[PDB]
Amino acid sequence: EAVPVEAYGLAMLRGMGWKPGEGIGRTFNQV
Amino acid sequence: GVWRNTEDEILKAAVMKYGKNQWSRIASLLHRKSAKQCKARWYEWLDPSIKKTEWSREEEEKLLHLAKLMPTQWRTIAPIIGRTAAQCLEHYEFLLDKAA
Amino acid sequence: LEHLQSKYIGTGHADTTKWEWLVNQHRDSYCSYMGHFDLLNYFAIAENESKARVRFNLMEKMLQPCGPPA
Amino acid sequence: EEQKERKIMKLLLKIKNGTPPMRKAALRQITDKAREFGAGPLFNQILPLLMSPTLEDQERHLLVKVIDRILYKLDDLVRPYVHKILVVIEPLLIDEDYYARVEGREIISNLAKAAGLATMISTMRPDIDNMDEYVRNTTARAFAVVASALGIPSLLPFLKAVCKSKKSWQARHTGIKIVQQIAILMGCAILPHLRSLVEIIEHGLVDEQQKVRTISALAIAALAEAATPYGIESFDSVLKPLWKGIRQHRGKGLAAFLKAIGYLIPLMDAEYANYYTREVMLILIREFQSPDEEMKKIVLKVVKQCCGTDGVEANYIKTEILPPFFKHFWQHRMALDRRNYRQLVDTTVELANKVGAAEIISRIVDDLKDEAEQYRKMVMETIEKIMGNLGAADIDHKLEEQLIDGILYAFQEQTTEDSVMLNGFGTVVNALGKRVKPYLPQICGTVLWRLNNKSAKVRQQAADLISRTAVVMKTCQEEKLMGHLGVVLYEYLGEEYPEVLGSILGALKAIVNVIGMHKMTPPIKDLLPRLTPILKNRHEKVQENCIDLVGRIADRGAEYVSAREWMRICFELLELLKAHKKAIRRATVNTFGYIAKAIGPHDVLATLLNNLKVQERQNRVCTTVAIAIVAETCSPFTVLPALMNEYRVPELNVQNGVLKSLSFLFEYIGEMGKDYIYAVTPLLEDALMDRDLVHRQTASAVVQHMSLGVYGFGCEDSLNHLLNYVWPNVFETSPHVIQAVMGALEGLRVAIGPCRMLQYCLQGLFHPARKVRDVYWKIYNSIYIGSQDALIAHYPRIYNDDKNTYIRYELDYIL
Amino acid sequence: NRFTVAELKQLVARPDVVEMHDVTAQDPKLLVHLKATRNSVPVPRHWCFKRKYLQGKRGIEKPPFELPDFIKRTGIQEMREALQEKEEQKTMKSKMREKVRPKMGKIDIDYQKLHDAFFKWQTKPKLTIHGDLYYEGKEFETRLKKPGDLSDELRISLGMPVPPPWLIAMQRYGPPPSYPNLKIPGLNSPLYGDVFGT
Amino acid sequence: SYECKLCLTLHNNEGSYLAHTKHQTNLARRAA
Amino acid sequence: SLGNVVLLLKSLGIHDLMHFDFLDPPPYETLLLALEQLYALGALNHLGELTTSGRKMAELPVDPMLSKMILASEKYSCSEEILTVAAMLSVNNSIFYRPKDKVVHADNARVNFFLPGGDHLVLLNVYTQWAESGYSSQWCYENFVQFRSMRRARDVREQLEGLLERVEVGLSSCQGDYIRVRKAITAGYFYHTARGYRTVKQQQTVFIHPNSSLFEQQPRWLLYHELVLTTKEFMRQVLEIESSWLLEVAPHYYKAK
Amino acid sequence: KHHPDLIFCRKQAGVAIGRLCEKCDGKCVICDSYVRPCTLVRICDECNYGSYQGRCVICGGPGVSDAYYCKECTIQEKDRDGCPKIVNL
RNA sequence: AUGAUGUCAUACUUAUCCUGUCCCUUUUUUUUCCA
Ligand SMILES: [Zn+2]
Ligand SMILES: [Zn+2]
Ligand SMILES: [Zn+2]
Ligand SMILES: [Zn+2]
């Protein structure tokens, strides 16, 4: 219903960490 | 195939100017109209001899009688009763809907 | 219209205050007196003051135009 | 705690829902209490907001602004929060989008300027030796952004200690990637640190690992490209082993060493560049046979860099590099690729500019006779670019005959619409100039043979070749062949296909433009009556080319044609005015002006006035444009009585045409209208008092163009008199008439001056009505935008009141 | 919240410049001060009208145009009307016959007459003042004909030489009560042309 | 332009005035 | 997207969805949008916990954004009609046959099933006319309907009719109130709305699919089912709404027109 | 010949040079006239940079000729108003 | 006495413009019947 009940999971994920396999984008030999 | 009231007034003025038997001369004035369309529009709706009244008892009795005699021949039936074919067909359908 | 046209110097609106328009006119007059050499010489050499002293007085008077708002 | 967080979301909703002044006030209140709130709840409210996918571009720009303001107000207060901000910003630093990577670089710059380099260095030290290449590349990009923000000597001994560390070669590879990405981000800023970075990377340049030596060669090439042209000797310590390493490396490391050699070659000494070119030329002759596409691209880039390198001689290149380069790099497999063909073409143009285009032209003349269409197109494009770059001075006679035969066979086999090949044909023969005179009857015979073909496209291409080559046919003044071509095209004028007929008309227009009227066989008196029924055609290309030819004739050679035929042309041009392309109508108006300049402006004006009163359709504005062009070309005192008397016709559309023609006339004549302002003043005064909004709108356009025309000529009395009728019409609600009113007000403020506009707006800027004062404020805002400087002297004299002092004492000072 | 018209008349030096609805403005004193200057113009009257500007005529007739004197001295209107009357009697068969076979030399007068009418015979027209504002009328009250002065048609009709027969009764009756500020020259203020008063 | 003075109505076309024959009620209103 | 199986993982007691073991982790934005949708749907608490209505959401196995038809049923009645609508929206292969050549007969057979108010009522009409016809393959062949994909729709409708006591929803119908059917669909579809040749939430421009029943006669307010981009940003399974009962359902998501 | 939509950039002009296609060649970039092409067109920013190199400052065709201001727009000096490249918003 | 209101037609304006659009795969439970 409210806003920050959708933000406590994102706050817990920000306090926990982040993995490179999640949301992996491929980019190489850029200029 | 639509007919605006402006075109009806122009057609009435053209019939009162150029008589009856000229139609291409009439259809020269009306844009996007043909002479056959002008003749059909005059003889179907805009002629002053068309009885734009209500049906009498005698007219309805003769219409029901002649529709019983000659079925679905309205171009033959209509000059006998004096109305046009569309008006008498519509009134016969209305009388059958009233009888049902 | 444009956002920068309303954001331009000297711009206004239908609900613009008279004191705000007068303050903008006074600030534009002070900026025109500071920019023009002949106007600053006419308003400076009439009194016994230097040109840079008159420029500093006009810079103080630019802030003084926002002195008594309402 | 809870109240501080509630105030944090209160400032968040005020920023994201309130006005941008209220958002700026909320940002100022947040930055004033940024030390009071702390970096903890600020990070806990910002990094979920930064990770939110629903933010717009203005939302993320405001987020970057709030992060920058909080970082500037916090400085070292986010020292425990370096790791969380780093792991949020590390996908933002690896952003594929340009604006997202710029925002990530700005966030990295804010984190480096706020927290400190040592905390980020200790954070990225376990991430330097990461096993995955993507994590190592993300760490390399983040450390390069931190080194670019904090400067090179802030972490250059630290980077030297990382690259000198023998704990793991992956950390050394990451450090060389840090050096290369920091050099790519810096460019010219790494110029004083070039010797230090070269001494740091000289240990990694001789590394036994293939990937570490490959990234060392890539970093050396990036340092050579970034520090152009300084620091030639600073990389000279890498000049000895890498030239040995090009004799030792194979595969991708050999290509990286060749790229580093090609980036280091144009900066060295000339004897050193000659020795290095002679050393690496054998490896390049080996590498022409390499089937790898990226290796061949690196070889072509190195060849272009060596050709751009000065001091590499001329005969040495043409004796060493060019025959195996032409044997290997010139094949159908090279032309089948897209980017490799363009790179080969650019390299061939650069080599022909470096060492003369005659050798390349003689060695690539047979490839125009090849059966492959794309290969012949690439050879023709390279030949056209070389001829447009250098010229045709070095072409031999047998070489010129081979070029003419090659381009004739190339035009003879043209399956597609190769218009760039047609432009290349025009470029080659125009570069040859007067030397094509022996080859001209062969070209003419082949074109006249292809004009009898079954296909319409062949005849269209042949007439396009005539239109391209008419200028160079007339350079030698061989008028017999060009006259014979004109006679054959006059016979071909009765074609039924429209594209072919338009191409023949364009070729005839080119021939008339390059010959002249007096030596034009068939003559103009026989040509223009043949062109008269062609104007009745309905196709657009035929109409455009034929109206262009008629305009060239009527501008240049109108003396051969009687006035009856010109009036017949004008009566056809009236029907031609109902076309669709605007260029056709513009050229039609220009032909009307040319005919009126030729034969006299009276009967054509009566014809145009009857067309204006007779059309009543979605045209006839061009009739007014033609009337204005006729009057501007033919002394508008001669036209204005008939145009003024045409206003008396009550036919409800000719008056708007008269006023629109007057507006177009004033816009055409400009400053010459001051003789006729007093003539057109009562006509505009009677037009502005009309009931219809069309008359008022078009008269407003008349006032606008007349005010902009004769500005600075003392006609402000009639302009003010017209403004006395224009300014009552400011209450109109239709958009076209109010746009005409706004344009007329702008023109009157330019012409008369801002003082009278300020006098008109001062009594209505403080109007009690909302809409009236809103419109007056719009007009005054436009006047103040146009005349901000001049409104100070034209400001009204208002005395000082109780709110503030108003009467300036500086204006009362007298010297 | 806002004062009446008496306070605005007492505060401002010009009570005639105060409007009927100027008191409901946010700055009535500033509007009265701006309206009292010498070079101001009033609001056009369409802001109070429901009718749009110059829109509700709908039934009147007007003369088409009055050309200036030099254009009529060139005389383009005569053969222009003759050409229009000749073209009005033509048929469309004759119209395309003339279209494929043109006939020039219709007017063919000169270039020097129009050159003289543009330059030598160029006359400066009558232009109104800077503060003039045209409205729905502004074409009928052209007297601003001075009061206290009889017109030329009434002087010619009553046989007044330039001594009207009613001027003796006008002198013996003093000034009229309808226009007390009007001064009649020759009998009350001792008058060029028909304007013998002000 | 065509105008009906009894109705005080402008007409774009000739058939607009030809169809303007409301006009009886406007004529009865303008009769007095 | 993982919107079907986030509810499946939450129904099996797993709360650490972002820290669950996998061969490779799914992106956190997909889980964030799935949890935001399940917040907008009536299945998650204020603490991100499954309700008993969430157990009703996860009982029957079709997608939750489709399974809000069932919880919208008995709030607007008409349960069987939206049940058959969800049966045609649960198919895998495409409905209707558009062969090489023919075209005109297949297009006329498609137009003969058209109803005002989107193609959900068209699919309901297809299942209705397939009923009282013997469920014959000859009817589907004569009307250019695939007899492989809509038998699957019949089996899905049969399975969902069997799974009605576990959700405790009766066999309800209206027989004419298609406004109630579209209101129940709008109660099920509040997140999938776009208007103004533009998304009302994501602000992305939209283009109507030519195979839709409302390719011409462009609407005033419409919802959808899918947003597949192939050449233009397309419009799959549109439906006519008025944005009047749009504020009646999901009031937290919907504000300011 | 204008439209009420299509505000252009309102950005500060730079050293990039405007460019016109042949379909709308010869038009003024502001008032859409054809009289006295006097002042060259500056197109401020990344309107020139990137994929939009040498394109039209009007409709969007491949540009062939230098765009110009007319003398009438530079009478009030509207050429300093900013970038005239059309951004479709 | 001129204001609002309706896709009804006819005039008119902008040197308006002659023009484009049909998805690769595929997976998700439980209960009665006649000599
Ligand atoms: Zn009437
Ligand atoms: Zn263009
Ligand atoms: Zn311009
Ligand atoms: Zn720009």
Numbering used by the authors:
A (entry chain G): 160 to 190
B (entry chain P): 9 to 108
C (entry chain B): 10 to 16, 18 to 80
D (entry chain C): 490 to 1304
E (entry chain E): 458 to 601, 604 to 621, 629 to 656, 682 to 689
F (entry chain I): 53 to 73, 77 to 87
G (entry chain N): 759 to 953, 958 to 1019
H (entry chain D): 3 to 91
How does the study describe this entry?
Here the inactivation of Aquarius leads to the stalling of a spliceosome intermediate—the BAQR complex—found halfway through the catalytic activation process. The cryogenic electron microscopy structure of BAQR reveals how PRP2 and Aquarius remodel Bact and BAQR, respectively.
We reconstructed a cryo-EM map of the BAQR core complex at about 2.9 Å resolution. The PRP2core from BAQR is in the open, post-ATP hydrolytic conformation. In this post-translocation state, PRP2 accommodated seven nucleotides of the intron, assigned as the 7–13 region downstream of BS-A, in a channel framed by the RecA-like domains on one side and PRP2CTD on the other side. In the BAQR structure, the translocation of PRP2 displaces several subunits, including the RES complex from the top of SF3B1HEAT. The largest subunit of SF3B is SF3B1, of which the HEAT domain exhibits a distinctive loose conformation in the BAQR complex. Because the pocket is also a hinge, SF3B1 opens widely to unclamp the branch duplex from one side, like an opening pair of tweezers.
